[PDB]
Design a protein around this ligand. Structure first.
Ligand SMILES: CCCCC/C=C/C/C=C/CCCCCCCC(=O)O
Ligand SMILES: CCCCC/C=C/C/C=C\CCCCCCCC(=O)O
Lengths: 580, 582
């Protein structure tokens, strides 16, 4: 009930108003980005009446909290389709895309220091991938494995020592938060999804960022758009179950069972009432500490995981939530912290490493800096400052995360899950090279650090088999869709904002049978030019002669290849992409 | 001063207002789509004041003998054209763009042909739909694509193909849908092969073609003119540009004066570096003549204002191109004549229905593109678009467009070259090849139809053999305020004789001269796309998998065996199976 496309014809074309939409309604479970994106497509392309769109939100502090997962790139094809239509709240007569596009041209993101070690020194080989030929072959062999052969396969099952010792793996695992036991299938999707940006892996020159935090820069513009169209925001609503009738030819959602401000209630559905479920949540059951208190660890399942489990009982086609929310290793990333300071000693120390003034209002770290020799495997980033419109102009907020949660720190000799905000700050300042006799005062009195414990922050990447995620529109579903980063669609990568928008758009287009193409995941792994660039970059900027110089059966296979293509367009292409 | 891009980010983003545009002006010289498109980009993306945009036009302000023009087929990957026409309001549908109107129409009534080639006075070619290329012919196709464009200066199509290829159905479809002659530019042939490779599965049945509701004037020009007029653009008529005085120094090229005749008075428009000049150099319609039902269109070799202007620019720098490669030494065999035959006669209309399998008066697709008469001495093809192609035409009428690739060869029924033929004589030759009884053809053409022939001396000129440098760059090296646009300007990869090329060069000219900070969409990346190339191998070999393709080649069979052993477990094998190559 959809088709994929690419190019300007389908991008700029508008769909006809879908048939009979005047008699349809929609319920969106939650107010995360996928739900809001789906509501926007229901308004813009479905032409559904705003009064018939209901966003059901469950909800009705000692410091600023920043989040991750909002790096963008140019080829977020669905996200830019959406946000060209959302008015900016910052610039008159401009969209969110316009604001974003102009900002990232005036102040393009890049890193001047990507990896540090030995308490604040730059890694000597920063910029190189240091991949052996064995490690490169493992990357290629993974990509040439069919996704259907990677059910439950770990990253450690498909790579060996050379790869795990490479700079490539340092950049990769920290920038995307891959753990060694995570899904090889998802790593494969990432390798092919972003291959056009391999020349920007080490310096983050392909990353693009909104001016402010994602709530300010993406959520509030969508909320204003939706409210201007009459969309209903309903608060204090907890969805406990959805009764679905699963017959031989149809799946139809019949009833949403809720608690509305303490009262058990029922929303009766017909086939003409659409339901969009964001199944699962990486932020559910988050806990918070403060400068003096750790965020208390938890394993609680909240409303989102409970709902997906209740749906999973009703059809095997609705997925297997326990693959994602159970058996999460205790080494996994759980804790992040936001450290806020106006202290000049800290800010100057950061400037000495990242080479830019953190208070200037432009790019600061350009993305995460990784402390390669930290026991916690800690990275931190400082976006353009300030990330909050109410924050004082003399303050920065730094985001810190640790890939390993059950390992004693190098300065604070405790696992991060036992650490207060100030203790996490102290470990960080130690790795910046702050003199050890100043660290305690700078962390406790000059900084305010809020730790957050997220039981499910690694859940998107857990090892999975085909079938564990429901299709966006399960087979024969008439009025039920699954959206967000635990729903299934081809090729695209989870833990990205694009995946939220793509699943939303595919859900709305399929359920309403909207007659317009959905942009395919960008065709870069099929593009011979992109692939030539990848060969050059993966081999740390060697041409084919240097690549093959130490292999008899390559050096002669290349000599015979070059003789056949000499003076041809193939040779000119290879010279253009630096392989000859 | 420009960059190429693709994808939705650059598609949907708007450029900042370019620097100092409030102090700039523009002059557009040369009629046609490219000038109008450049004016539209100046308004929309340049944000130039309409009062400062001057469209200079030589003409004065403006069973019938309708005249249609052929070959204005569009496709989905006209990337620049759709960027433009999403911004042009439709004149037919409220609160919709030209793109919207076009998109919905071609979804409701998708174009395709149920009969592409006929022979023996109205019978369908038995192999219609197949390419019938030998392995040798396919190798010649591949070898041309693998030739660097730099090595194809002045090379003819007959220099790079031999007998098998010219005997193929592929060449029938190709030469007639694009109007290639055997002596034409192999360079341009190569560009077409690479440019449209994503549509190879639609070559024979025209399923990739898309058409506007009406003729190009009604459906593209009038919407653009209304857009420009609503923005205050200056349309200046009775202006003939004789020359542009250009300073070509060691460091800059700067247009200094436009020398014109304005309504009979000699005038000079003085230019500063801030006054931009856009020249559509050369013209395929210049010097056209018209006949009628009883009169041939008189042949001519006259050069008019467009070719004379380009000659006057070329003598100021070789970087401004070489018009004589395109407007001189055109072989007398070349296509010159087209005709539009209008009728309400039911016998003719029913004969067309019996061949194309669709009711010509229903308002939908009729022939789905040209039908080629493969055994006609004139190498004639004809098309009937959705009818009627004119808003005010009676609903019981059709207008058929007819052209002949060979102009100096006697016809099969009217035993004269087409250049000696009246409208009714061209109609008679056409009706003969439809299979209408020879006892009926003369009166059907003379008294039941009205056919208007047109003789265009330069209609094949885009494709004349050329060398790199014969076309000026859109913005020549060091040009400050002078651009060349249209289908005799030079830009990478794209194909001339397309409306897309007119819009692309217009966009590139405006973006470079104003330094507009937004990407221009690259020519679509299909020749680099492994999925597209897999499909091309399958289609070029008339739907054979790799085993069948290589079965009679020892070297190829052996290479394939080793490849298959390496890829058997793998994603490469699944991809090849998906594209029917295994
Ligand atoms: C053949 C495979 C070779 C390997 C190709 C790998 C490329 C990796 C490129 C990384 C640059 C970052 C791209 C932007 C990512 C945004 C989403 C996110 O940051 O979450
Ligand atoms: C290298 C493989 C050979 C490629 C063969 C491909 C042929 C393309 C077939 C059909 C093209 C249809 C759309 C083109 C419309 C452009 C306008 C015009 O027609 O003016």
């Amino acid at each position: 009930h959809m088709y994929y496309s690419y190019g300007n014809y389908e991008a700029f074309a508008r769909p006809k108003k879908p048939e009979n939409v005047e008699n349809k309604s929609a319920y969106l479970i939650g107010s995360g980005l996928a739900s809001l994106a789906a509501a926007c497509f229901l308004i813009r392309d479905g032409q559904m009446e705003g009064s018939k769109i209901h966003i059901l939100e469950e909800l009705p502090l000692k410091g600023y909290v920043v989040r991750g997962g909002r790096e963008m790139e140019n080829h977020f094809e669905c996200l830019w389709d959406l946000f060209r239509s959302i008015p900016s709240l910052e610039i008159d007569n401009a969209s969110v895309l316009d604001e974003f596009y102009w900002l990232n041209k005036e102040d393009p993101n890049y890193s001047r220091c990507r990896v540090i070690e030995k308490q604040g020194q730059r890694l000597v080989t920063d910029g190189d991938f240091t991949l052996t030929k064995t490690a490169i072959k493992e990357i290629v062999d993974l990509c040439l494995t069919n996704e259907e052969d990677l059910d439950d396969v770990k990253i450690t099952d498909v790579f060996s020592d050379d790869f795990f010792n490479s700079n490539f793996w340092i950049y990769w695992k920290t920038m995307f938060a891959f753990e060694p036991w995570h899904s090889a299938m998802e790593m494969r999707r990432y390798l092919m999804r972003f291959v056009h940006h391999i020349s920007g892996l080490a310096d983050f020159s392909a990353l693009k960022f909104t001016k402010y935090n994602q709530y300010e820069s993406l959520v509030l513009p969508m909320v204003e758009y939706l409210k201007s169209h009459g969309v209903q925001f309903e608060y204090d609503v907890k969805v406990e179950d959805i009764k679905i009738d699963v017959t031989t030819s149809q799946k139809i959602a019949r009833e949403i069972l809720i608690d509305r401000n303490g009262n058990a209630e029922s929303i009766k559905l017909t086939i003409n009432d659409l339901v969009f479920v964001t199944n699962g949540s990486i932020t559910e059951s988050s806990t918070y500490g403060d400068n003096d208190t750790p965020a208390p660890p938890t394993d609680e399942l909240g409303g989102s995981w409970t709902l997906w489990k209740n749906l999973a009982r009703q059809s095997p086609e609705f997925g297997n939530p326990d693959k994602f929310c159970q058996n999460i290793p205790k080494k996994s990333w759980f804790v992040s912290a936001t450290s806020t300071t106006n202290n000049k000693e800290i800010i100057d120390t950061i400037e000495s490493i990242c080479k830019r003034d953190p208070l200037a209002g432009k790019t600061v770290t350009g993305g995460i800096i990784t402390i390669n020799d930290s026991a916690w495997q800690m990275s931190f980033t400082i976006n353009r400052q300030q990330q909050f419109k109410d924050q004082p102009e003399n303050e920065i907020s730094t985001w810190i995360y640790a890939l390993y949660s059950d390992v004693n720190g190098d300065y604070i000799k405790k696992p991060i899950t036992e650490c207060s905000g100030n203790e996490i700050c102290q470990e960080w300042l130690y790795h910046l090279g702050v003199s050890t006799d100043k660290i305690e005062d700078l962390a406790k009195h000059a900084s305010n650090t809020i730790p957050v414990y997220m039981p499910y922050i690694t859940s998107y990447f857990m090892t999975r088999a085909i079938g564990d995620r429901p299709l966006v529109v399960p087979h024969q579903s008439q009025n039920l869709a699954f959206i967000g980063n635990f729903a299934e669609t081809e090729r695209d990568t989870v833990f990205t904002t694009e995946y939220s928008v793509r699943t939303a758009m595919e859900a709305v287009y399929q359920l309403l049978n909207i007659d317009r193409g959905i942009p395919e995941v960008i065709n870069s792994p099929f593009d011979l030019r992109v692939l030539m660039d990848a060969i050059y970059e993966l081999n740390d900027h060697q041409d084919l002669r240097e690549i093959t110089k130490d292999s008899k059966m390559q050096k002669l296979a290349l000599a015979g290849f070059l003789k056949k293509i000499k003076g041809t367009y193939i040779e000119s292409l290879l010279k253009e992409h630096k392989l000859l």
